[PDB]
Design a protein around this ligand. Structure first.
Ligand SMILES: Nc1nc2c(ncn2[C@@H]2O[C@H](COP(=O)(O)OP(=O)(O)O)[C@@H](O)[C@H]2O)c(=O)[nH]1
Ligand code: ALF
Ligand SMILES: [K+]
Ligand SMILES: [Mg+2]
Length: 307
C-alpha cells in the first residue's frame, strides 16, 4: 500500500564522489541527485538528476572554500532543488564539510528537503587534521548548520580513516569504507521497507526513530556460525569511523534478518548486546525478517538516536 521513495543527494565534490561511487556499486529503488557549483565536476556525475547551483556567482567554478557562496548558490536554486526532491519520503544528504559548496549548500538542501515533507538524514565528513585548523573550524560550522536542518545527522571524521588503513591502502579504498556508512544505511532502510517481516517494522517506525533526533548511528553487521547473533550485533554498533558511537543511545530501531533457523534466544542476545552497549534504558523498536534464502547467515541492522 505505501511505497516509500528514497533519494540520495550529493552536495559538492565529496558528496558527489560518494554518489558516483554508490551508483558504481549499484543501488536500486533509490534515486540520486547531484548538486554542485563546479560544472566540470557535475558533467562527470553519474546521477540521473543534476543541478548546477550558483552559475552566476561562480561562473561554473566551485566556491573556492567560501561557504557563504555555497549557501547563497543553494538558496538561489531553491525551486530547482524543490522540484528534484518533490515526492521523496526520505532524503539522505551527503557532503564533505570544510569546503565551500558542501559546507554552505548542504544545510540549505537539507532544510528544503525537510520543508518538502521528507524525513531528512545528513551523512557528512569532517576534514583530515592535516587539512588544517581553518578547514576544521569551517567544517564545524557546517556540521552545526546541518544539525539544525536535518532530522538526524551522521558525522564521519575523515581522521578515522587513518585508523583503518595500513601504510599502503589506496586512498580510494579508504574512501569507499566511508561510503559504506551511507550506502549500507540506505540499503538497510530500503530492505526494511520492501520486505515484510515476521515482527514487521515499517517506514512509520523509521520516522519515529529518526524524526527530529539530532545525532544518529546507522550500522549493519553480518555473521555466520556460532555466536552469529552477538557477533553481527557487535559489528552493527562498533564502526571505527563514527563520531557518534552507540553509547548514550536512548532509541534504537533494530532489525534482525535470518533464515528459518533464527532462534528466539539469539534474537534476545542481539537485543541485549545493543541495550548493554548503549549503557542506557533504550526504547527499542525491534523487528525480525525470515529470509529462507539465507542459510547460516544473520544480518543485524541498527539505527540509534536519542543522544
Ligand atoms: N571521505 C571523503 N572525504 C572527502 C572526499 N572528497 C572531499 N572530501 C573532504 O570533503 C571536504 C570538502 O571538499 P569538497 O567536497 O571537494 O569541497 P566542495 O566541493 O567545495 O564542497 C574536503 O576538505 C575533504 O575533507 C571524498 O571523496 N571522501
Ligand atoms: F570545491 Al569548493 F569550495 F566548491 F572547495
Ligand atoms: K517491512
Ligand atoms: Mg568542489
Amino acid at each position: 500500500s505505501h511505497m516509500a521513495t528514497l533519494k540520495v543527494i550529493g552536495v559538492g565534490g565529496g558528496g558527489n564522489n560518494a554518489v558516483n561511487r554508490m551508483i558504481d556499486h549499484g543501488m536500486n529503488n533509490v534515486e540520486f541527485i547531484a548538486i554542485n557549483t563546479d560544472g566540470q565536476a557535475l558533467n562527470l556525475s553519474k546521477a540521473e538528476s543534476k543541478i548546477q547551483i550558483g552559475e552566476k556567482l561562480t561562473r561554473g567554478l566551485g566556491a573556492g572554500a567560501n561557504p557563504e557562496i555555497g549557501k547563497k548558490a543553494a538558496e538561489e536554486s531553491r525551486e530547482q532543488i524543490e522540484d528534484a526532491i518533490q515526492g521523496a519520503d526520505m532524503v539522505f544528504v551527503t557532503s564533505g564539510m570544510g569546503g565551500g559548496t558542501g559546507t554552505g549548500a548542504a544545510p540549505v538542501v537539507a532544510k528544503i528537503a525537510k520543508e518538502m515533507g521528507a524525513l531528512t538524514v545528513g551523512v557528512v565528513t569532517r576534514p583530515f587534521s592535516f587539512e588544517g585548523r581553518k578547514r576544521q573550524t569551517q567544517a564545524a560550522a557546517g556540521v552545526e548548520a546541518m544539525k539544525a536542518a536535518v532530522d538526524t545527522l551522521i558525522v564521519i571524521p575523515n581522521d578515522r580513516l587513518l585508523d583503518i588503513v595500513d601504510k599502503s591502502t589506496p586512498m580510494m579504498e579508504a574512501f569507499k569504507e566511508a561510503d559504506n556508512v551511507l550506502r549500507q544505511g540506505v540499503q538497510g532502510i530500503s530492505d526494511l521497507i520492501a520486505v515484510s517481516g515476521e515482527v514487521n517494522l515499517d517506514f512509520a517506525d523509521v520516522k519515529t526513530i529518526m524524526s527530529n533526533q539530532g545525532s544518529a548511528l546507522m550500522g549493519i553487521g553480518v555473521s555466520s556460525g556460532e555466536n552469529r547473533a552477538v557477533e553481527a550485533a557487535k559489528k552493527a554498533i562498533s564502526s571505527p569511523l563514527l563520531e557518534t558511537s552507540i553509547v548514550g543511545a536512548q532509541g534504537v530501531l533494530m532489525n534482525i534478518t535470518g533464515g528459518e533457523s533464527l532462534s528466539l534466544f539469539e534474537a534476545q542476545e542481539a537485543a541485549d548486546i545493543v541495550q548493554d552497549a548503549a549503557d542506557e534504558d533504550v526504547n527499542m523498536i525491534f523487528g525480525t525478517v525470515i529470509n529462507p534464502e539465507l542459510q547460516d547467515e544473520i544480518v543485524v541492522t541498527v539505527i540509534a538516536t536519542g543522544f
